[PDB]
Design a protein around this ligand. Structure first.
Ligand code: CL
Ligand code: CL
Ligand code: CL
Ligand code: CL
Ligand code: CL
Ligand code: CL
Lengths: 269, 242, 266, 265, 264, 268
């Protein structure tokens, strides 16, 4: 339904108190977090991370929000990573973990540079829609640092072990077509259409149930995150269980102050 | 502890029709019991025994009156002393025990040895008689179980003990098994079935969906994507329960 | 060479008593399981699953069969998903995984939803140019709770797997091939012809090496369950060695085994 | 070290301002204590309780004076009996990823959700009156998360299945024998021994402790554990000369030059 | 991109003394090159070849002037065609040694990389392939198999469907097919093989060697369970010793870590 | 088995030539013994020690007459008190080497097994402890740690609660505490340490060496991801070469014909 998918978008500002980001919510349930430091190619400082964390937590808790977009202000940079001129030092690890465990899809909308710490951010997002002017890569080894967490292992789950080793060991830059060919982004679109198409992808997700998306994200995370992934799966299993008769017999027994009785339930194969 | 209920007599009905090597019985309150019936060879299994255990366990899984399965051997001297369709069909039976959404309880008197030892380990719980004897024999007899018999064993008793069990192939008495965490409890032989049934009945009073989910969650810590498949299966069944 | 590989195939019917599928075997060792409900786009119901489980176990135990083909009747659909209990398909999926013989999905037209997970569980997928792939259904149950997801990510990678599940788009044969979902794409008219060639290439090779490698590749995904498969092959091999046989012979004749006769390899 | 040092009295300083369900206290030698303060309901948590615990634990993580955190319940009869009558999953992760040791100090009941919380703490010091168990399946609930798999890494697969499938209660001696708690002490000595254990860890390198905690989580938590462990490697690297060359070169308006560093074996 | 530096001539100093099956050479700017030198038998390895390769690689590892290693075959027709038709299976030790080597190892491939030879190139961190390169396994064809990193690790490179295809059918794949499935990092004209390989090597050589070893361990740790944890944590242990807090522990008089910040 | 056999005298033959920091000996019934010989420093290892141990273990591995290795310290007071604090971390190589050795490696511990020395006993497949044995880490006290197998693998031995205790507090534990937590396999009187150790080795030596290497790899595989699969699969490969179908490849090459697998049976 292209009319629906490409219908205009109505953004409402929710940036009060924020210095380094914009936070906006659409009427049809997309939240957008925008890194707003274009003069340093949207590099994050610890303050910027703090604000993103708060913005993301809000979006996670807002039942009107079904999908989150992460992006950079302007056309030239998504995020260039940590600010080199120096709310603590490595708080971006918290943010990474927050994106990871967020029960709603998070979409990186990338124009221009997604580099270093900013490249790991887009990879952490469930999906990435890249503009044709997008540029990708790591810089760690070039400037004597590294991300050996999800920035390494999860990257390898996206593009394979050979490419991951290439990306990190050389620290080259890769354009949008290259990113696309190695499986690094989901699609490449003309710069002028970047949000239009990103919003279309969001609305296609919004057609599916929130619970289904939550279960699917947890299952895919679970292939990577061991017991932390199992814990995500179980939380969803607990939520599902509460919505069934058998999972309500506990509470209903405690209402009528009687001992629970599970004898009336089928023992399925 | 409503022990009068827990310790009440059991109404067993026979379902052993067509089986040569095993007995298969069901109780009205939801226990199925699969008994290896070859006491002359200390309840060692052949491919036929295994084929029949697979049938009986598939029957118990599909009977919605059955909540818990008991695996055991005939008589007082042997749970199962190892292996004598095809040669290694016990591997199928291991998988089937593992993925059975119902608790499976090994009720062990005397020898649980070799292939027979792996079987009791595969069961969710083990209730042992004070005359129970445990251990592997593979390396002593030119064989080994490097599957769940190795790795899953380590998840029960720890890497040091697992290596001891496999490399030396000693026998271990009931107290030794208890102390290393190999079995869940030791009871006097005369009370073996009585306590086993009490344990089954305590589980039968609990949410069967809860047990099913928890068994898969605990398996998921070992079985990688096969474990995740179990969890996803449960999430689906939960959803179709609305 | 091409002469052998593209020779005519002689199918013998083994469909006796099956309502929802056809089951056939070639003289040269290929078994073919065909979902036979093209009137409903080859969607399966619990009976279809039960029959397929039966057919597969037959193929597994048939010492003349080396490779299994799974496919749908007609040209329009491989399998469009589900609607002998409600979720027995999950058992059939595991039986495919643990089958010590290669299983090949032969896909024409739709491979959708539960039907899409099916082709993915197969070791290889041969796709016709009219093939269409994708997941479906807004609700958890229509996703089977993401049953299939982790393994799909081992095929197409995490970004594309999240795309496939979260948006539920459809993909054509070229798109499937470019992301690694299928092994090759061939003209619809050449589908069986190419599939049989692929099967015949596998049939030329060591069946024991095939089962060991399949178990080995599964073991990267399936934790201890994979170790059980892989180790069970080692045990099967060990029994076929002299050191294995000395240990057994000693136990029978009730003596101590002399293993010193065998070298302690480094 | 010194037993006199280890068993010196402890001066708790109240930090509970704006908390309704919990008390939060700090000692001068570096211990934070979070007490569930609902003894009337056997220290069960309601969502407010969990919310305040998250806050306090966040505070403690950020207080450079704190090296070790104690989680406990008020009075002598209960540590935590689980949810009243899903932010607790958030609190569980927060305990897991806290770079400082977290010690469950258990008197009486640690039950249901309250049992998962003690297991999530790095160490458990149990009083002789302590009772442990799950209740989920008895009451139509279950924790298939860390409550299951991590439990199995503590007591083994046979015991974890028994605990979950039957939902019995276990006394302190039983918990100790299956490796569920670290030590059992007389109830009167519970805090005295716990503070001793905390002070022992406080004597050690905090960096070493956080690296080890991450290393141990990493045996359970796949790439999430790698993230914790690699995060620490990255932090350490910043404290080395080679790790500062990047930042130095930039501040010196020049190209990084790593040729000046050893290429170790 | 300083292509003058990157494409500058390279001078190999010979370190091959005492080697029968291989050549071992070093450049001044820090590249070690191990060349399988059995072109009579298409560069197939025997136990002695493996033993020498292990020696050469251990030398590269302990040479503080070496930052990257190139593994390659002599001549233009074969990188390595596999095992000859320490001990028999010693190639397994070489594979582990490539894996735990704290310096990048690059397979430079011309012509055949087949069988045990194909697993060799996969074990290397990167593979630069000539346009005449050919890849594939042969195990099932000749009744053997590599079920180790030869199977699982291949799957982390090309994906599960492709890995099953490669092993089950044992076809050969040309340079473009290898590139399209992510099996090699790049494909260049045969005449430029060493030129491009040296450029890639020089690019890594400009970067932090500590950073590279840490990321290599981190990437291995996604496959190798506790063995991966050992490498990763071993690097952490090494970094920790280089800090004041680590050094204070050594000097400790009982140690005092009170003067160090408890970071969040 | 026969206790007369198991407790027969043991005869150690010296193979220590060239070694400065260790002794290395072999018995004729197939046991190699590597003894850290620095008792004046409680058998602490320095890099030289580790290098010699690696060399000795490599020899034990390639010696077809050796089926089991004992790792031990000289005298009665120490197994190994850890890294000598007076290349740098070559002990990690030794750790991997103990791990991937296809023969059982048994730690024989009298007195202190501490720090890096405590990780060494854990790496061994089995540990036989004397009644005077003492165990524990020290890293955090002296500003260091082993977060590799020293942490994760210890957790597979004692469980996550005890592992955290051991590492976070760095206490010492006696032989009884060690046995109770599953850290050692058995505790024996000091005077019988070698006697019982040699008994255990001889029990293993009666079993199939192939079965033992396969099981060791299988048990490593529960911990070591693809590195463990490499070991396990490497054994499968070796087993395959000893079967007729596994020999067809080489027979076909020798007889100058294409391999033919049609003549072999398929199994379910
Ligand atoms: Cl970076
Ligand atoms: Cl056995
Ligand atoms: Cl509970
Ligand atoms: Cl091969
Ligand atoms: Cl993994
Ligand atoms: Cl230490």
């Amino acid at each position: 339904d292209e009319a629906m998918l490409y219908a205009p978008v109505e953004w409402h500002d929710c940036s009060e108190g924020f210095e380094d980001i914009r936070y906006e919510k659409s009427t049809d349930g997309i939240a957008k977090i925008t890194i707003n430091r274009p003069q340093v190619r949207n590099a994050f400082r610890p303050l910027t991370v703090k604000e993103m964390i708060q913005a993301l937590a809000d979006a996670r808790y807002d039942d009107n929000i079904g999908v989150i977009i992460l992006t950079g202000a302007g056309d030239k940079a998504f995020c260039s990573g940590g600010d080199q001129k120096v709310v603590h030092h490595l708080n971006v690890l918290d943010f990474q973990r927050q994106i990871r465990t967020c029960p709603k899809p998070v979409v990186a909308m990338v124009a221009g540079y997604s580099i270093g710490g900013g490249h790991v951010l887009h990879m952490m997002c469930d999906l990435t829609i890249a503009a044709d002017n997008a540029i990708f890569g790591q810089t760690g080894p070039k400037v004597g640092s590294f991300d050996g967490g999800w920035g390494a292992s999860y990257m390898a789950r996206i593009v394979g072990q050979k490419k991951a080793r290439e990306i990190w060991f050389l620290c080259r830059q890769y354009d949008a077509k290259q990113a696309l060919d190695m499986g690094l982004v989901n699609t490449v679109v003309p710069l002028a259409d970047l949000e239009k198409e990103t919003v279309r992808w969001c609305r296609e997700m919004l057609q599916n149930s929130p619970m289904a998306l939550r279960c699917l994200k947890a299952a895919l995370n679970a292939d990577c995150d061991g017991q932390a992934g199992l814990q995500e799966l179980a939380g969803n299993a607990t939520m599902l269980f509460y919505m069934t008769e058998e999972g309500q017999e506990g509470r209903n027994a405690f209402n009528q102050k009687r001992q629970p009785d599970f004898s009336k339930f089928k023992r399925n194969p």
